[PDB]
Amino acid sequence: PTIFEERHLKYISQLGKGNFGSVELCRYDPLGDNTGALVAVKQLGPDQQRDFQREIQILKALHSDFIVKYRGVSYGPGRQSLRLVMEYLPSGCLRDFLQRHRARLDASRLLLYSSQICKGMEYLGSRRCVHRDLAARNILVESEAHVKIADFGLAKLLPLDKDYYVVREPGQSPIFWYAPESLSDNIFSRQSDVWSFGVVLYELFTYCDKSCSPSAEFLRMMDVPALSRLLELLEEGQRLPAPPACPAEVHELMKLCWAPSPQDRPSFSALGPQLDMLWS
Numbered sequence: 001p002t003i004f005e006e007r008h009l010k011y012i013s014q015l016g017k018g019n020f021g022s023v024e025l026c027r028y029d030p031l032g033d034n035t036g037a038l039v040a041v042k043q044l045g046p047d048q049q050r051d052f053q054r055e056i057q058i059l060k061a062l063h064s065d066f067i068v069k070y071r072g073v074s075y076g077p078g079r080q081s082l083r084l085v086m087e088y089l090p091s092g093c094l095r096d097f098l099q100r101h102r103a104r105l106d107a108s109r110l111l112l113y114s115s116q117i118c119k120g121m122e123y124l125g126s127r128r129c130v131h132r133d134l135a136a137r138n139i140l141v142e143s144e145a146h147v148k149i150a151d152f153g154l155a156k157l158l159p160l161d162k163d164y165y166v167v168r169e170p171g172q173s174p175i176f177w178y179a180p181e182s183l184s185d186n187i188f189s190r191q192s193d194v195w196s197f198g199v200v201l202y203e204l205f206t207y208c209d210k211s212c213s214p215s216a217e218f219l220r221m222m223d224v225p226a227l228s229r230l231l232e233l234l235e236e237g238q239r240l241p242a243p244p245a246c247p248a249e250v251h252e253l254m255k256l257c258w259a260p261s262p263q264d265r266p267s268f269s270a271l272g273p274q275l276d277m278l279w280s
């Protein structure tokens with residue numbers, strides 16, 4: 001079941017490109033008659049090949065309604081799985097779903113999305129997994145009221161005696177989703193995933209509008225390099241403003257996810273009942 005034959009994997013479209021690899025829309029068509037199920041296939045480098053096998057084993061060990069379903073692999077020279085096969089969600093990434101259907105998604109609908117992302121993250125933390133690229137662009141839409149965490153290319157497992165990990169090479173994702181410890185020291189933990197969540201929370205309560213986006217807004221508040229400016233601003237006490245018509249209660253939780261000390265930050269298991277008291 002988990003061994004999908006590449007010959008039966010028929011190319012449809014490019015789903016995306018991010019963090020060295022690419023995701024393609026394929027049809028797993030063993031009958032060769034265009035009736036088979038659609039699946040999302042990821043493919044990629046020496047440390048890149050160790051990082052693909054890392055992504056595969058992590059996702060394969062993840063079993064949640066709020067994490068993209070792993071379907072299996074399409075093997076190659078090894079021991080070395082040529083490609084990773086995931087479930088396909090035709091609604092796609094939450095960022096463009098938000099933009100496409102905003103006139104229809106209200107506060108209640110956004111809190112349910114928040115609480116679902118939250119339980120997914122609480123689960124990932126339980127597996128000792130730190131996502132490191134939690135953004136609305138990396139959240140998928142299963143149905144109108146069901147979202148899932150995706151893109152585990154930069155995900156890492158935490159050692160049993162360690163609750164944080166330091167990355168050698170700099171960040172390549174948009175800088176605005178990182179915590180001040182990730183920016184200044186490349187330190188990552190479930191606490192740096194919590195900072196990122198409050199940014200996802202900001203994203204939901206803007207419907208990912210490009211004009212007031214995390215990138216567009218720092219651009220206004222900001223010779224000094226653009227990374228050191230955000231470091232300067234965040235350490236001083238500056239934060240993204242309350243999104244247009246955002247409830248005062250949702251915004252306060254955003255600023256707590258944005259506590260400057262990472263130990264002070266609320267956990268995901270702590271975030272959930274608070275998002276669940278605001279209903280849906």
Ligand SMILES: *CCC(=O)Nc1cccc(-c2ncnc3[nH]ccc23)c1
Pocket residue numbers: 015016017023040068086087088089090092093094095096137138140150
């Ligand atoms: C909306 C922009 C974006 O990031 N789209 C994106 C990139 C890569 C893959 C997907 C994708 N779409 C649908 N089902 C998927 N399953 C796994 C990954 C999927 C979307």
